[PDB]
Amino acid sequence: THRFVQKVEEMVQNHMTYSLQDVWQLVVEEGEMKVYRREVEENGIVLDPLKATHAVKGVTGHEVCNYFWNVDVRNDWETTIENFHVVETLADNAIIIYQTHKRVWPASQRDVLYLSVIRKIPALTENDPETWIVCNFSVDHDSAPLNNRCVRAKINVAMICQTLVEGNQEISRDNILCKITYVANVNPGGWAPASVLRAVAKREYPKFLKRFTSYVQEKTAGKPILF
């Protein structure tokens, strides 16, 4: 019932419709992780859509999404931010976050102001696993005005997670696989030199996906499974 409910449903639906389609240049492949990028410059602004897939043993989609969304563990895995805070809590599954990013010479420092929502998308019936999604997308908020010290990036990011699993036995983490699709469409919000930006992305996206997925595996190991 919060004021962004209509926008959230639009953003989530568009991801479920378009973000799972099969793709674009391979940036890196390492184990089960594949990172792809489409080269796109629009009016000189580098928009380069990013899409990655991964298959992570021993964690569920619900777990992966909880850890990606939960701001309390953010600093345990995220390495590209200087500072962040929660501007507003909209619902138990929806918050607005302001954050500033590490500065990359020679461009101005970027900041971002986004709604971050976590949603369970049921299967047709409970015979099949639900999909979990976290969507982070830019919004306006009067408590976080555009400022003169940072260039305001505009983002649409999603992490979409599918969970793949004898007699009376218990399910073990060794027999669960989480298939992750991560998409990032980032508008840097102003001019940035293309070569510099592209080198940063090439390095930082795979770094993040490795670090983040390893983190969840480490923190869930030996804990009861949250489906």
Ligand X SMILES: CCCCCCCCCCCCC/C=C/[C@@H](O)[C@H](CO)NC(=O)CCCCCCCCCCCCCCCCC
Residues forming contacts to ligand X in the complex (CB under 6 A) are 78, 80, 101-102, 104, 107, 110, 112, 136, 153, 155, 157, 186, 188, 192-193, 196-197, 200-201, 204-205, 208
Closest distance between ligand X and the C-beta of residue 163, in Å? 20
CB–CB of 210/33 below 8 Å?
A: yes
- Least distance from ligand X to the Cβ atom of residue 110, Å: 4
- Take residue 3 and report the two structure tokens written for it: 């004021």
Is the Cβ of residue 46 or residue 59 nearer to ligand X in the bound state? 46
Pick 78 or 88: Cβ nearer ligand X: 78
Nearer to ligand X, 173 or 202 (CB): 202
Q: What is the CA radius of gyration of the chain?
A: 18
Binding residues: 78, 99, 136, 182
Q: To the nearest whole angstrom, how small is the minimum distance from the Cβ of residue 224 to ligand X?
A: 27
Q: CB of residue 79 vs ligand X: minimum separation in angstroms?
A: 7
3-state secondary structure of 64: helix
DSSP state of 81: E
Q: State how far the Cα of 12 lies from the Cα of 7, in Å rounded to an integer.
A: 9
Q: Which is nearer to ligand X, 35 or 176 (CB)?
A: 35
Residues 6+ apart with CB under 8 A from 37: 24, 25, 27, 48, 49, 50, 51, 201, 202
Residue numbers belonging to the annotated binding site for an N-acylsphing-4-enine: 78, 99, 136, 182
- Angstrom distances, CA of residue 101 to CA of 150, 216, 223: 9, 23, 33
- CB of 13 or CB of 80, closer to ligand X: 80
Provide the residue type at 182 as one letter: Y
Parallel, antiparallel, or unpaired: how do β-strands 45-46 and 94-101 relate? unpaired
Phi-psi region at 160: left, alpha or beta (left = phi > 0; alpha = psi -120 to 50): beta
Least distance in angstroms from the C-beta of 95 to ligand X: 12
